[PDB]
Design a protein around this nucleic acid. Sequence first.
RNA 1: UAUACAAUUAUCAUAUUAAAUUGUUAAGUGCUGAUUUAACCAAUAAAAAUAUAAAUAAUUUUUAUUUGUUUUUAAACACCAUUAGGUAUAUGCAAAUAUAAAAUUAUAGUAAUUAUAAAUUAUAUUAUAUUAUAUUUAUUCAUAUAAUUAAUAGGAUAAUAUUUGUAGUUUUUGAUACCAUGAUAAGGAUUAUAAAUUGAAAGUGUUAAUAUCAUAAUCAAAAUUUAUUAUUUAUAUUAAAUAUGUAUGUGUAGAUAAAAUAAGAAAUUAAAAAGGUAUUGUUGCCCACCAAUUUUUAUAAUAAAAAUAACGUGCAGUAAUUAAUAUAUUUAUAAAAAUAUAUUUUUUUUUUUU
Lengths: 291, 100, 274, 207, 49
Amino acid sequence: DKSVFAAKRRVIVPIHPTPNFPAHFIKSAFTTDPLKEKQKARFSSGGEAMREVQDIPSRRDLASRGDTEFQALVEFIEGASYDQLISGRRFKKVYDVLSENDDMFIWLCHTAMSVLNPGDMRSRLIYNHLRILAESVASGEMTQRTAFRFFESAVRSPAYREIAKRQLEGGAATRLAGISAAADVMRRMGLTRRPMSSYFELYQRIVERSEAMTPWGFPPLFQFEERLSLEPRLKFFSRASQQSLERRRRGHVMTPHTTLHGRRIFWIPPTWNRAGRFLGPHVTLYPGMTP
Amino acid sequence: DRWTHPQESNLEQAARGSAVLAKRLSMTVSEMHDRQETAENPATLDRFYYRIQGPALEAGELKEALGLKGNRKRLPRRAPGWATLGMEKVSPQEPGHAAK
Amino acid sequence: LHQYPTARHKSLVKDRLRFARNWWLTGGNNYELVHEVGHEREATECFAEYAQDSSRDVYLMSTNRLSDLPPGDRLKAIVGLMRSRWEVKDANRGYDKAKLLLQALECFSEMKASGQIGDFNSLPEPDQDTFLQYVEGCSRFAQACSHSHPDAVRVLLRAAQICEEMRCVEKRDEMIQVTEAAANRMDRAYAFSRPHDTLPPSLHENEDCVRLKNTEELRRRFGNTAPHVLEKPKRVDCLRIHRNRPLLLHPMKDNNKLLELSKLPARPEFDSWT
Amino acid sequence: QSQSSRGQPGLQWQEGVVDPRYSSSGNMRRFNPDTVAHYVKATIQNDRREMGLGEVYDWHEFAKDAVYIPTRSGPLWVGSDDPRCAKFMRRRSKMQKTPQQKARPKPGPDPAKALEDHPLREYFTTATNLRDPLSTANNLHRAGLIREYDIKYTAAKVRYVPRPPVVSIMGHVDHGKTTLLDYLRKTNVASQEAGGITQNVGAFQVK
Amino acid sequence: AYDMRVVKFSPKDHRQWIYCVLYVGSGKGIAGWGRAVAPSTQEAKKEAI
RNA sequence: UAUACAAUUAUCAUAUUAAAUUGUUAAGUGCUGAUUUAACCAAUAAAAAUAUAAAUAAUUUUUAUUUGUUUUUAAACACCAUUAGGUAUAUGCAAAUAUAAAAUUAUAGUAAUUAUAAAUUAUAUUAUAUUAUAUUUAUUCAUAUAAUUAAUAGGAUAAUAUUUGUAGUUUUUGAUACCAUGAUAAGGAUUAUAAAUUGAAAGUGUUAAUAUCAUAAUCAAAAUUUAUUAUUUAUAUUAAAUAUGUAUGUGUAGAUAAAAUAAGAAAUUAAAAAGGUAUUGUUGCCCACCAAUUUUUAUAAUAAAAAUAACGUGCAGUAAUUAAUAUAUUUAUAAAAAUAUAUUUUUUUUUUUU
Ligand SMILES: [Mg+2]
Ligand SMILES: [Mg+2]
């Protein structure tokens, strides 16, 4: 390390005051001053910009918003034109916009399946309980764990176990009413722009999980959000649970040196200062022949 | 107080104010109305995320040269009385000089 | 047996969590936020003034004699001297205090003309009050010291002259009256003025005579026939102890063997027996 | 760097004799090649050899510039050119160049004028002058026998009364001074005097 | 209070963050405390708040 | 200097209601001889196997007494010797960690707290499985010389300048024959076929702040002793800048170099765990001894304890180079070491009636 403090020990130089690095203020507050701006403003002002600039392109924001998922998808789609490539950042943005609402789907699936005997979902009392808790989860005012606890400990009927002894032999009720109520709540509440997406997610996250070991058994710690969690691919009702993506790739002896010699897409382009001998990513030293 | 709000010179304060004024003037009336950037609200001059890799001492020297960090500048000593300008030229803290 | 790092403080070596021993900053994912905001009022309002300033810069030279100073600064010098002079305890009678007050009054008289302060009416209320207090104090001290120093009449006359040139009629008339009174009252205190009059032992002084008489009458009575005139001895001396309770060393009674053993020589074989 | 050891100070002197270590001939801070063994010289040479330094041609001359450092093991004898003693040599050279380098406080006003300004100045009294009546009148007032208003009256009214004379017998040693005083006093005290000489001032009234 | 602490994400990646502890209060009867660690003073204050 | 432990769980000597104690069996060649061990080794070498049902929890254990040294056939076996052997197993002598506690150390006076914890740090693939590796070729390696670095100054075919021929000595001091901050190189071991490249950032003589006798510089015809370099092998042999006289010896010891890319080569391979007493972070803490100063208890030719940055001998401990801890014995330059017995703050590897 070459600094003043280190050099005072490395080689004692009697000339203590010495600027090791020239002053160059990258920030914006330091560079400007009133005297500079007094001259700058006359030449560059809002009126002058409006005069010499062409027009190339809450309630107003909602009017101009349109469909967020479609506007995100069309960017990745249009990335296939001649003057641009298929950016992975665009797909990441589309995935985030599509999966922003997955938490409510996870919670609704957990309430539909994990609860052994929720009662009669058709009953307006239980329906109101579920609707209020789902609205709270969607708004974020209550976390999923506490919402699930509220749903499973809410008041339903006196002598609940004795009454259930008449109907359920094992305490497991039919899931048709639960799924219907979980679809109805999301249909009534304007959760997503497309009404069918809620029902499709609720159905698919159940039918995909139904073919797994202990389909409806969940450990208490990992069932919801916690300090220690699971991988996104290994979550219970996740949309990316099932995958077989390539995870082993062969590597040659010159790989650590030629990490950047392939068709790499550079976040920062190599320069001559850093890389002594590297032509670039677009060159091919052994070209073929094409008609 | 001195930790949360670092002290800065009057020249730096004036430069910040002039930069805000320049940004406001350069903005157009239509976009100002859309953004609700009236003279009451403070304007955000700039905001960026940087990443620095290197030895600690040399990084400190580099940041001081670039003006990224302070905590070692020797700012001038403020007046013992009311440091703000425009105060009365002669004002004794103790009135005194009374009769009878 | 105690481990102690000599190069570095033990606490600094121990506090692993508070500091960082590694000196290499790596990028990784360590983003830092540089956020800068400003407001329009910062351009003008609320600007501080630095302590050091060339306007309030003074080169202070020193001199001992008062005549070097202008009267304006000489008044402050005289007051600074009187601050340390007035602590002298002399029953508020003296000549140096009157001299200092006269010097201050002469400073006022000079500053009337050279210092262009103006007239008494021109001078505002507070400095009028200071001038009146100074002249009154000078008059009081001169009157107090007049009977001893016959030059206090001259001091009072100069004070009256200064009042005249300051154009204060009410004080000037009183100064005339007091000068007239003192010019005739100064010689009264001297001996020649009062040849009619001429020029007591204390309680302790008288009791000393009583004690001496008693001692002499006991001396002649018992100094030869029976020497019992000696006073009661105070050979026992109090020594201070824990709670300052005075312990007294009572002399030993004759009817014990301790003094008999003490009076004998320590070593009979070698010490003389006579 | 610091010549003083880290232990508590010890007594410099024994019953009557000085400790050899603190004696000038056997000073503990001086490197004496005569009385030291061969291993200390070997260590000094090895230290001057491992680090780039000149070899010791003469030990008697080297001892003059040798520097002692107290260590837990014992004395450490080092050269004045050595990096370890470089800092102490810097400070010693600066001291030898200019000793006055510590800031000195500004003295206050002159104590004579401070005495003039002293609150208790007026309480001072001086010895009376025998030929001056004003002095004894003022001292009468100072001792509180008369009034300050009556100082002048007493100065005018003070009378002078003769007093018995005081004569001092003075002369050389063994010149019969004590015998003359004894004959004047009609006593014989010179013989009983210790040593036959006068050693204290004696004032006696005679007729 | 403010303090300084070390943060270790990787064995060869050590940084010095600062630790801010504060609270928000209102005499109407509502209060809440917090403590956080962040690279800078402003970030620590915001996270603690 | 006076001024409010705990009582719901505290690892070094506070054991006190508990069933013990005793069994009589096993093993017995000499034969033509290399067993054990990292190595040396010694002398007949095979052996000792039986349990449960049953003894009240108490109001004076205030009370006896008791906790792995316990004495002989073999096998084990610590001092010491070095050519290499000797040398310990309850019958007596012996209260004792399973805890009623008041910051470290210390005789309950010596220093100013002492310990401990967490995170991180280069040692351990497992056997179809993210690749068959296995073949060809090569190796007598050498060059450096004759000293001066610190200014601008215009011309023919242009409306005129002798400015043809322009003339003011001397007060500074480093890249030079050391040293006189930084910066590019070489070094292939896991991101692969596909519309594609088999050369790295961790630094290599010359380059940008420390000064204080420094003229070391090719313009030819020159002086191997120095690690880092592919030379032509037996039909025809010296002409233009002057250009190599040496070493024929069965393709021959040791040691060693190169290539899986327009070349031709093909079944056994990468893919686990596992640590800081160090924070100055192994070039580290730390250990006694040696050495040096000195303090306290003490007056007795005493003993003991404590503080200290550099020396000397070492490397004992710190997963730390034959593990560590506790007690007993023993040896001695010193940390300690070896044994007997009891422990793991020693990092760990799968057998439910074959
Ligand atoms: Mg005599
Ligand atoms: Mg070791």
